[PDB]
Scaffold this active site. Structure first.
Site, mmCIF file in Angstrom:
data_model
loop_
_atom_site.group_PDB
_atom_site.id
_atom_site.type_symbol
_atom_site.label_atom_id
_atom_site.label_comp_id
_atom_site.label_asym_id
_atom_site.label_seq_id
_atom_site.Cartn_x
_atom_site.Cartn_y
_atom_site.Cartn_z
ATOM 1 C CG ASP A 36 -9.354 33.082 -47.479
ATOM 2 O OD1 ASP A 36 -9.215 34.594 -47.099
ATOM 3 O OD2 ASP A 36 -10.002 31.846 -47.745
ATOM 4 C CG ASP A 216 -13.486 29.570 -46.084
ATOM 5 O OD1 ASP A 216 -12.549 30.191 -47.026
ATOM 6 O OD2 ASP A 216 -13.665 30.554 -45.441
#
Length: 325
Positions: A36, A216
């Site tokens: 992440d 992201d």
């Protein structure tokens, strides 16, 4: 030999997530991780976690590792899908062929992270964001590796896997030309918190100047400002919106800066759900409003574009990902 960078193979999961493996402990306890760029902490479920979600996961047992350094500071981490609670611990973390003692969250309670946790195959999450975005003020793993002189540069790259096409790679330490084609363009960060950059957006007749764009890896879709999406989907035959995969009205996203141009054609944001209806496609786009015009260039964008996240140069590099390597 030759490969001076640290490469971690990535596997796709139903075209909504992708995982990479790493280990914790002197005995190399294995774990599957969500990688992440939107968070900055590393966490693994503890053998002390006794929630139902944990019974199906690989668990971390600090007592089986010589290098374990107790901390115990209480901590809770929040994500879009929920919260996990535990305490800090420190032990040897191995990513690919590199290792280093690292501070992470040993999770004991996951009931606040359901149904995501039980319904998914990952064990924990490995953050690849910036320090200020973390809890416990912990330097990013790649930043740490660089300071320890274990890698040539404080950067990492993502060549995402593509469902039913090919696996991917998280590469730490250097940029490898084999992952992309065309020019590699850098965009400077407008904040040292998220991997956020400035780009002008144009879909149809609708446009937005100098919009904030967050690259992201933890977001499965491309998020667009509500107002923007509405206008974009006007006149279009789209009843998270589903439509005919052959819809020729579907627009192409256009993102531009002073240094580059990036586009996202329908084939990159349309998901086939033919099992629901013949030639039926799901729109992998989400309406999401931030205080200011913002786009989250998630997995759909990253599957098309190879990306490099440079801490040293505070920028994100973007290039067309090769279709096959």
């Amino acid at each position: 030999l030759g490969s001076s960078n640290d490469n971690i193979e990535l596997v796709d999961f139903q075209n909504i997530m992708f995982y990479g493996d790493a280990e914790v402990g002197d005995n190399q306890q294995p774990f599957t991780f969500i990688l992440d760029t939107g968070s900055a902490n590393l966490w693994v479920p503890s053998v002390k976690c006794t929630t139902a979600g944990c019974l199906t996961k690989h668990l971390y047992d600090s007592s089986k590792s010589r290098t374990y350094e107790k901390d115990g500071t209480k901590v809770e981490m929040n994500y879009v899908s929920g919260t996990v609670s535990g305490f800090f611990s420190k032990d040897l973390v191995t990513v690919g062929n590199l290792s280093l003692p690292y501070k992470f969250i040993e999770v004991i309670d996951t009931n606040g992270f359901e149904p995501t946790y039980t319904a998914s195959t990952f064990d924990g999450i490995l953050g690849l964001g910036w320090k200020d975005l973390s809890i416990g003020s912990v330097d990013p793993i790649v930043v740490e590796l660089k300071n320890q002189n274990k890698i040539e540069n404080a950067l990492f790259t993502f060549y995402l896997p593509v469902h039913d096409k090919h696996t991917g790679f998280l590469t730490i330490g250097g940029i490898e030309e084999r992952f992309y084609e065309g020019p590699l363009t850098y965009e400077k960060l407008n904040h040292d918190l998220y991997w956020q950059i400035t780009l002008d957006a144009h879909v149809g007749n609708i446009m937005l100047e100098k919009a904030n764009c967050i690259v992201d890896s933890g977001t499965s879709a491309i998020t667009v400002p509500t107002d923007f999406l509405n206008k974009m989907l006007q006149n279009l035959d789209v009843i998270f919106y589903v439509t005919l995969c052959n819809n020729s009205k579907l627009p192409t996203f256009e993102f531009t800066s002073e240094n580059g141009k990036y586009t996202l054609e329908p084939e990159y944001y349309l998901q086939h759900i033919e099992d629901v209806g013949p030639g039926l496609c799901m729109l992998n786009i989400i309406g999401l409003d931030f205080p200011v015009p913002t786009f989250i260039l998630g997995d759909p964008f990253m599957r098309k574009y190879f990306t490099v996240f440079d801490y040293d140069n505070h920028s994100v590099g973007i290039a067309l990902a090769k279709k096959n390597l």
